[PDB]
Amino acid sequence: SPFSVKVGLAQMLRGGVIMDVVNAEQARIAEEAGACAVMALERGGVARMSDPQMIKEIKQAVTIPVMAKARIGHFVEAQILEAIGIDYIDESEVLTLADEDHHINKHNFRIPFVCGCRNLGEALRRIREGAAMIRTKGEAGTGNIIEAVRHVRSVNGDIRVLRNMDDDEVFTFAKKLAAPYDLVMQTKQLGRLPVVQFAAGGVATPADAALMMQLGCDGVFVGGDPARRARAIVQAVTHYSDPEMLVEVSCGLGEA
């Protein structure tokens, strides 16, 4: 099935770190430091999809997958991103919401989508709409991971509750989550999220990143010395259960 293929496309990002970039320079610095992928964006004000010009320049400057953001519900922005060869589309709430009541119908695309979530029900709804990859979003641009921890714990928590639940109670549970029953049972069977799950929001230090991995995330997004901090976080994700290593890459990192 086309969906299972998109899901498979996102699995090759596991154990990786995705970095925001706004120019070709950053993209290289990001790829140089071992980022699994880069996220193209040009940055109050209304935040929209970035100019295809700058997206094309970044997709040309690196050999790793290139992602870009489309406003929530802005399916035409998504069509434009798909037409320009982008590897992943991030229907992202850190952009200015374009539709308050509906997300993009993501099945109608060939490109795999990333969607944010704060809890399990929200993750499953996004997945049912076509999301091939979930990122549990804390807060944006604060450097505080507390919200991400909440959400990661929330999603993983409910998954564990689901795994061991009496089968006859899953119906009511699906209702309470307001999530599709099929996907709820599928999540019960797998004992995890049916798609890749990253963490995003406030990851500011190597320790932050490794914490997300130790909590269960398949990877992380990141929004003094960048080239140094970048490698440190990459290393953190790869060796998230190696304290000695975590000490070494955090040592003399600089102002965060």
Place this chain on the structure above:
Amino acid sequence: SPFSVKVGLAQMLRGGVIMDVVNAEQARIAEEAGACAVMALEIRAQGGVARMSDPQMIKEIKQAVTIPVMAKARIGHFVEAQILEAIGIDYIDESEVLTLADEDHHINKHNFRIPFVCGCRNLGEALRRIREGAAMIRTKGEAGTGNIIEAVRHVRSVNGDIRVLRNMDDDEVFTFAKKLAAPYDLVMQTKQLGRLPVVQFAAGGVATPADAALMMQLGCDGVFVGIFKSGDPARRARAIVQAVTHYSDPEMLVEVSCGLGEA
């Protein structure tokens, strides 16, 4: 048990003054004035997010002094803790003066070989931190104000309920544990023992020798201090130390409080 051992380790801090330091020089002054230990960190008046401090500056401090060296790890940030343990600090302070990292869960401190200090405001909160593996407790008032009023409230709160618990009808303790929301076993252990089953320091707003001595007279085993935010740090630090060691001696307290400079 390895928990009995960590608890024992902290016994050595009794009668001590722990001092915050942001560099080497300070850690040397803190030891020179007789601090029983230093607490390394790189908040209220500034903002931003306050996290674990950079290992580099922790390593430098641990090299500058011979007294135990502490460091703060954000609440719930067990990876910050792992990093501190790896660096070879003596104690980790899972500290609520840093930016909370997990709003619903504290670090599982048993999973560590290094002893933990946790803050508290009342008895239940202390007993919960201890069950989580905290080997040392500090009843925190308010941070960075220089006002001791909240520390006094918390010290009296904890000690007060401990006295209530000590003389309580045995059949009523279950309900007391519920109301405290604290493990019954630890409550009975506190009852039989007549005090916190671990070392208990005062912290928050301790600005003068009289403050420090006051905490000791209220029944604390020692105090934390934030000293360098005053006129002459060395003299003041020395005075607070002397105050803790001679807390029940007004003559000495008058001696060390004399000509201290702007607090």
Place this chain on the structure above:
Amino acid sequence: SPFSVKVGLAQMLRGGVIMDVVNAEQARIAEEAGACAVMALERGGVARMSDPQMIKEIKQAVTIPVMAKARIGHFVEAQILEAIGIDYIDESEVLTLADEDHHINKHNFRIPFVCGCRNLGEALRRIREGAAMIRTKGEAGTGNIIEAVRHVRSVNGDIRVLRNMDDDEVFTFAKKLAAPYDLVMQTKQLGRLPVVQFAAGGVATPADAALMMQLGCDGVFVGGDPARRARAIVQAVTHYSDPEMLVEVSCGLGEA
């Protein structure tokens, strides 16, 4: 009894004026103008006991009794003041409260204490704790006596109510005041406060001071030309029922 002796110590302040001082200079100016005693203090921010250094310098510069402030509930600050020879300790709410639920146990000291109050119940509670002298406090540092008038009237009012009350109703009255019954009856017998009672808060002019005396106060605290204003207020307290005199000392006093 040691308490009756402390009470006696405070009686030698009757008909007098106590003045705040922050240096040896002021202390002399205050004693020169005929102050019965001086109050040593070094002044937002947290307000604490003053440095013994400056307290010692003031106790040396004058031959009149020297008072100093301890934060409410800060019994160690009080121990320090007692050890340095201070004549009176003012457990004062104009300093930063150190304990919200308990005052110093004043019996445990040899030095006589002054405590503030806003009504009778509060005065009696302070006295039961060991207070040897009461000051009915209005507000601090405003120059407005309205609050002091309220409190002086409140205390004196209830005392009068108490004096003539049916004996069988005093129990309930003690409850309503939340004050110790013994002291309530003792206050009934004496027909006044069992200790010296001064007024404090906003006393800014000779007329203010004489008004307090005419209301019943045993004296006053005071927090253009100071040496002139000081003598005027002293004279006001001594001759509080002599209008001609009050006119003379208020005449051309200056900005208050």
Place this chain on the structure above:
Amino acid sequence: SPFSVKVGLAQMLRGGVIMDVVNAEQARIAEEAGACAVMALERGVARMSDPQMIKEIKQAVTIPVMAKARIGHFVEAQILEAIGIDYIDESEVLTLADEDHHINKHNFRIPFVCGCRNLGEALRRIREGAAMIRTKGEAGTGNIIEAVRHVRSVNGDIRVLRNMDDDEVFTFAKKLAAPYDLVMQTKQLGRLPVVQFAAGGVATPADAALMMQLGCDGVFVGGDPARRARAIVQAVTHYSDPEMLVEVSCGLGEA
């Protein structure tokens, strides 16, 4: 001390059962079962009992005789004293006569009993002159639950007071709304400075022994009356002997 003498007159009851009675018959039956004293009353508004019915009971028994006065009705008390009664119960079970004041009991020679629900109320009644306290519960229900609450309240607060930091006792007195002196005296003694009975809903031998095991010096009590009375008396005398409690509770009859 005239008060200390009154307090003493009450201790002599420590370990007994006081039973309400409405005639010479009941009073005799109650004395036969072993009551340490009887409480005379006739049962709308409820008042002091008729001086005649009280005298009839005073002559028909050898144990102390108590009688109820309405809260605040100091003249009813004066009358009871003039009748030569042994104890006056300024009782909330009767129709409250003064909602704001209790009798000034220091103006009487006879010893007074007053009810209470917590420590403050107890200490306030004592300061007014009460020489004996009955921690009341629920009256006329046969349900012991409220009496247990108040006994636990009083005893619990006493224990808290016993171990409290001296410097904190002032504030504690304020919160109790109780005389500070009487509070420090209670802290020094480790108990109420007067005899303390339980009353309200005590319906079975088990109820009575429970009250004693909770720390009460005795109890008030309001099928086969004679049988139950003896059983309750025995329960109080042997409150920590399960075999006894079983024995006197067996075949008790509808309570």
Place this chain on the structure above:
Amino acid sequence: PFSVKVGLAQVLRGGAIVEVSSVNQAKLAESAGACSVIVSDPGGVRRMPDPVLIKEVKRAVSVPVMARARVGHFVEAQILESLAVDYIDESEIISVADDDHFINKHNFRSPFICGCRDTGEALRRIREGAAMIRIQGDLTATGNIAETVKNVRSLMGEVRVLNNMDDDEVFTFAKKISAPYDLVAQTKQMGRVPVVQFASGGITTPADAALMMQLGCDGVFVGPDPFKKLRSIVQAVQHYNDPHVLAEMSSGLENA
């Protein structure tokens, strides 16, 4: 010795316990295969039953005999333990004698059963010394199993959530249900409540009894033609997974 009482109560697994009021009812219940009988005499105040009646029931049957004490009435319990009962049910069906404290059950040699409505409540009763829990629905004789089902499911479901929980989250969980952390861990490690758990309240038919068993209970309490209904309920509990058996036993049950 607590482990001894918990062991004893196990012999009850797979049984039905019947409320009896006479030796006649106790005999029937026994012949019908009741694993035990709970003795009681019956608005008004409901207390411990007459020790005489209890002795007759104990003498009139061989199966273990239970009796009720009011909540917190430890003296009533002393009596029951003195008369040699096999189990004491500290029962909320009777009039509570203490609203703030339960009987301290570790002071007795007799095993205790207590009621509960959720896991927290169960764990608190157990730490107090209950050797057996009954998951109580309606306290009234309503014949409605609705609340019983609610409380059984709440119990079972929390145990299942606990079983799978991230260990680091168990502390907060213990705080939330106000249960002793150490019993919570024990419950987690064992994947079940550390003592026998029976259903009680509103069980009126064989179908009701079998449902409680299929919901995971260890047995049931039960409060026209009584003998027939009794044996049917016993059989229902003994063969709770067998529909044909259940149909047989329900056939011609006069009226419940």
